[PDB]
Write a protein that binds this ligand. Sequence first.
Ligand SMILES: Nc1ncnc2c1ncn2[C@@H]1O[C@H](COP(=O)(O)OP(=O)(O)O[C@H]2O[C@H](CO)[C@@H](O)[C@H](O)[C@H]2O)[C@@H](O)[C@H]1O
Length: 162
Amino acid sequence: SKYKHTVINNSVTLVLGDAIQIASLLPKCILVNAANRHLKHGGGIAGVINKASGGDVQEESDEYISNNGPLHVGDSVLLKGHGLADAILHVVGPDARNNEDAALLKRCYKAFNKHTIVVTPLISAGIFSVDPKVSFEYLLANVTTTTYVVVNNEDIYNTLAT
Ligand SMILES: Nc1ncnc2c1ncn2[C@@H]1O[C@H](COP(=O)(O)OP(=O)(O)O[C@H]2O[C@H](CO)[C@@H](O)[C@H](O)[C@H]2O)[C@@H](O)[C@H]1O
């Protein structure tokens, strides 16, 4: 009630706000990180998540990658929550700057469905340069679990809330 939000369907609610704030307010959830293949959390929401954890997320990510190697585009890994959420699902969206196809978002978003409540940004809609409407369409097509999709730009919110 205390956020600008639009319920899209039985599963998906679009929220104008801060994903970390929204994950904090929910008693139980997974928070999704829009990550890169090497889980190097230098910027974007990955940066905000890592900094909110005081670097704990990067420490854990480094251990995962150091031992297990880089992820493939479209893959995800469930890691610890570091007090931000019950767990963080690191999802590697396609980077359009590197000619990676938006259709790989299908794989990203299908990974949500085994989790009861998910708080997510729009995957690949930041520097990975996928149209927010396209990302959101892939989300709605593939996500069947209770999901709060959080955007921090009112203009993008308004466009998607149509
Ligand atoms: N509450 C909220 N707060 C902040 N942002 C919110 C938000 N809710 C949604 N977002 C948005 O979520 C989006 C994520 O999109 P991307 O997949 O493009 O990020 P990316 O994969 O590039 O990050 C990766 O981008 C490059 C990859 O090389 C790396 O430097 C970086 O570390 C890695 O995370 C951004 O628009 C971000 O603003």
